[PDB]
Design a protein around this nucleic acid. Sequence first.
DNA 1: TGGAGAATCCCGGTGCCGAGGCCGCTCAATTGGTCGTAGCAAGCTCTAGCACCGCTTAAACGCACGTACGCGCTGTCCCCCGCGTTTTAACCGCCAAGGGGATTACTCCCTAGTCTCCAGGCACGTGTCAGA
DNA 2: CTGACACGTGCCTGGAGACTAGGGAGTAATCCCCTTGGCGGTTAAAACGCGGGGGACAGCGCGTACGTGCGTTTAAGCGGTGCTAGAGCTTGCTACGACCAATTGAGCGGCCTCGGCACCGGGATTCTCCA
Lengths: 360, 105, 93, 95, 78, 93, 90, 79, 77
Amino acid sequence: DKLKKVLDKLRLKRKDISEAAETVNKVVERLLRRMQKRESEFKGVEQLNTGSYYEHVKISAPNEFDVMFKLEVPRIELQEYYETGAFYLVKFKRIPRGNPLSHFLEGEVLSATKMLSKFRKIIKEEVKEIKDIDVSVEKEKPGSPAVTLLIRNPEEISVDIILALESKGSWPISTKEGLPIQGWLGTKVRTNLRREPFYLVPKNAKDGNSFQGETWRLSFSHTEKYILNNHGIEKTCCESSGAKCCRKECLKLMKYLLEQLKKEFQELDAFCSYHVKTAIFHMWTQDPQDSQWDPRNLSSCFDKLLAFFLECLRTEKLDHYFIPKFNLFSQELIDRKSKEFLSKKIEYERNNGFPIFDKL
Amino acid sequence: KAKSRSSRAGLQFPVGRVHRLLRKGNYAERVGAGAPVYLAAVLEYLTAEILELAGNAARDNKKTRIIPRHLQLAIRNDEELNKLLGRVTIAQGGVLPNIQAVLLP
Amino acid sequence: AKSRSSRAGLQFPVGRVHRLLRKGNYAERVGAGAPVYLAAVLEYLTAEILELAGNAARDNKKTRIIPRHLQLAIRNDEELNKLLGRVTIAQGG
Amino acid sequence: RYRPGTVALREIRRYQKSTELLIRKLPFQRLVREIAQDFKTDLRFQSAAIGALQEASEAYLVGLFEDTNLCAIHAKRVTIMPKDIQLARRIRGER
Amino acid sequence: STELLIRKLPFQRLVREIAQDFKTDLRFQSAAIGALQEASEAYLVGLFEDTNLCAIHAKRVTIMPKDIQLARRIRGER
Amino acid sequence: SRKESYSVYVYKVLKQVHPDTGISSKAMGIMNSFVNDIFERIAGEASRLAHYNKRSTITSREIQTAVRLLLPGELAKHAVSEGTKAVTKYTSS
Amino acid sequence: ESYSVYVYKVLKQVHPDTGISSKAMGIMNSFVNDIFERIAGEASRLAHYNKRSTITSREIQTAVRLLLPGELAKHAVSEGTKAVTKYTSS
Amino acid sequence: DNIQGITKPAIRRLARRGGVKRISGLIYEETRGVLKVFLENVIRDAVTYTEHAKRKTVTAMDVVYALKRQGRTLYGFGG
Amino acid sequence: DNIQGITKPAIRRLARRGGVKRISGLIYEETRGVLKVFLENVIRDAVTYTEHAKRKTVTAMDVVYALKRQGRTLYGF
DNA sequence: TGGAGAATCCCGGTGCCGAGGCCGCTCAATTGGTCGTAGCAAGCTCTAGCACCGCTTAAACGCACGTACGCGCTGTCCCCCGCGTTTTAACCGCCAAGGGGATTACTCCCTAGTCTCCAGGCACGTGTCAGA
DNA sequence: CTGACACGTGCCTGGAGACTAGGGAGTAATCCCCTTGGCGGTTAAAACGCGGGGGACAGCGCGTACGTGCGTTTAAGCGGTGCTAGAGCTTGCTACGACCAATTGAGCGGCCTCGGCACCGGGATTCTCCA
Ligand SMILES: [Zn+2]
């Protein structure tokens, strides 16, 4: 019905993603190669196969793209300042041969300002270097650590590359009671997933005062991609022999609902597309592989999706999936007025047959 | 009431037990108030420094526990710890796998 | 009156050895035979090294003991060479 | 038929990747008790004391061979020899 | 016989140069360098004693910069 | 009777670094031995320092010197910076 | 303080006609201090191992046997024991 | 006697752990005299400790203390 | 140019006391590095011992202790 | 390179026994006070560390040179290596018993602590002869 | 030939001689655990044999780099004059650590569950090796 049609329209969005991939993949496959031999601190920075990977998981604009460059680090130490797992600042432990990054410090903390400035300098040098690939670097703004690089083409396209430290050590102590996929994927999958590395993306609090630019937030987008691709408690479910379970499709249509709401109306700019994913990850552990993940009754799939979403909005609680003591939308982070409006909007679009999906 | 001396200092190791050990052992006629706090902090630092590397060695082995084979690859792959424990045998640890390149064919 | 060394029949100071044991942070208490035993041991070792070095000087015809003679006496005896190995001496050459 | 030396490198990567004790435990116990009989008669050993002695004696020999391999590679050969052991033990303070 | 083999003023200058890398402005007793030198000479005499054997072993008479690194590799210093 | 070990605290310290990782009760014997070895090294060196200077009190300024001249290289810099970070945090309370 | 008076008395009988320079005596004092600090520091650990709170002659004896090698130990012990038998007898 | 219980395959296994690639034939009779020189030293002291406690048994602590006295510290057996 | 104060005739004088009869031409640059490395480890400790006493001179007994810590006892100071 | 024969790596199910969680309790850490003396703070003496300078001359430097020895090359033949068949005695389970380490209760005698009387031992000064 | 050891007196400071209190160390009696000794069966590991091939060892020859001697130069060693930092000791007081009570939560021992991991079995791979 409307849901299958919207899913086909998401496939059309995949076609547009291919149209963008045509230029961005070509750019990166020849741009990243200069980084390794440049003989700097950013040498050895390699893109991590995370995010959409041509899929719809990115949740970015139709003419915009995003990718992340994972730079490894020696012995990252994490400290959470005046926050609850939502923001972290990096320091270093004893390293016998000095830090490779011993000149990006601000005392003991390693700040995103110096690293991103050096990163953008190197990127601008490279884009001015190669002539075969038509690449540029648009001017910088102080509101985002994304070193955007607008690409000239018959039709304008832009991309941005986000630095993200990579740490091979244990996960942070704020995630111990997180990622509850035990009854769903099994304790084996978890304990073999909390061995992977974790990333730190540079993010400014923009609400505190003491340290603004010198703060990094955890990123587990690789584990997120893992769980999206090979979902299910049956090893062949969506891996072979048919057996099409509709749980990713429900997430896609919910994400489209949120995006259409945010584009249609203004104040919903304070809730990104990531909250929907956290809701779905908290919900999939609510009922491991019931009979109600079948292609039929999919309207029931969305009844329950909304049910959970509205329940989180009304009670003022939705914990970050990996950090279970970090309310993504709360009064302190987001006052109650906007989320009250969002709950009203979800209620309304629940009724009247979802008018938001007529103009799509 | 009744705060423990090792909670004020922010430590996990026992400041009170360390002070008692310093007093009962024949180290000096007196022991200040900042000696147990300094020494417990240093001992906790070193213990965490060994245990984190040992845990990384355990985890890349795809295990969930630390065995003496992991406290050997952590002391003997580190410049400074290897030199702090160079005259020490870790029972059931083995050796570090090095073979001279003139023996390879 | 009688020094403890005289009673024990020694030359080294039993009293000073006892005091150095008590003030040295060795153990809470110190028996009454530790001073005498340790003084006897130290006297034996020094008397041996002097017996050796004095007749190691007599070979060279010098009537005084210098760091060279003690060095040679340590490095010749098989026993004192292993006790006093790992040891340097000033102008022992 | 593997050429000579190949099965000598095959089992260096094997005994260095492990931690098992490389002597037989009962012959070693007999040796330990026979040596100790010269110090005190009718003597008993905790099963942990012999484990400690064997683990401490195998580390000594492994390190000694690690030194003698260098003393052999120095003289431009691969076969270790008693002279090689006697050099490795003499640079050290052991003789 | 028993007398020093390095020259005293060059060694004193060496000692002070090495020390200024730790304390910015320093001074030594007269016996704190007669001891540092007097022990440093014995260290090298012993190192040459132990590196003569690492050349006899290799069927040579001329000690080389390769069998001084062996008396040190085997003694734990390297 | 009752044997006192550091197992409680070494396990506390292993849950800060690497939560979800345990010890095999013989590795814990390794770590108990390591703690009682380093404790004794530091305490003996500090005890000697207090005696070279004719003092009679081990303070936080002798533990610091012992940590400086026993730990090698960078370990000596990070170990003191956490020893003094805990003697201030301790007196401000 | 120094053992420079007692070493001289020992020399006066071990080699009644020989003398000792100043620097040789200096080393003599260093040697005696080293031996004292080794034997006493071994007796301390012997007492601590057995959970005892006193240094007794029976621990100087075990420290001597553990430290001195070979026929030195066998002699040192004797020249120690005699002294104690002479001391407790008065 | 029991020293011959220290076989040739055992010494070859130790050598392979120590990196040695080829082994002369006179090594084994040479190693049996080295180990027996090592043991006779760690035991003569491990039994000096035991006779001091007034014991008939040689505990693991006697062994580890006697090993400390030689400069070799053993972890995992107490202390 | 201050280490070069350890003149070649001095390295040879030491080697002839170690029992060497014939000395390569490359070991002087090696003996100098070895000597400097040895001296750093003793002077580091001598300064660490002097600072603790809050003194400015580096006394002789301070060097004796720094050496003793290395495992190289030294008599006559 | 090409591929046969072997080691080595690896992954979906056993099953056991040890890591770790929990509970009662005891004894060791903590709170609150007192007391006394180790160490800081300041001030002062004067030893010895730095500094320059001039002259003598032992020792570093440089060159010549020719002979000793380092290093590659070649041959060859002892003697270890790898593999196979056969002997043996180490490893494992299982039970028993008794020697000895460990625990507890008087008890006494041995070391610490204190006051005081003073002879051994350090410092300062003088006066020689061993021997640099 | 001189300064490096030998020997001499004043004295004050640390050791010798008691005396007492209490607590560490010596003894006797029980408990239980843990070291030793035996039995018997696979069976894993040591012993033995033997062919050969890759390596220890000897021999030989060139060449280049080390040792001795000689003419010249650099700077170490002794001395002497002289000043200032700073080592070393002293005297106040005071505040920090030792010690004793009384209270009390942390840490040890005992207990008990089940999850990590050691082992097996059969691909699947990936070295080595004659060619
Ligand atoms: Zn599904």
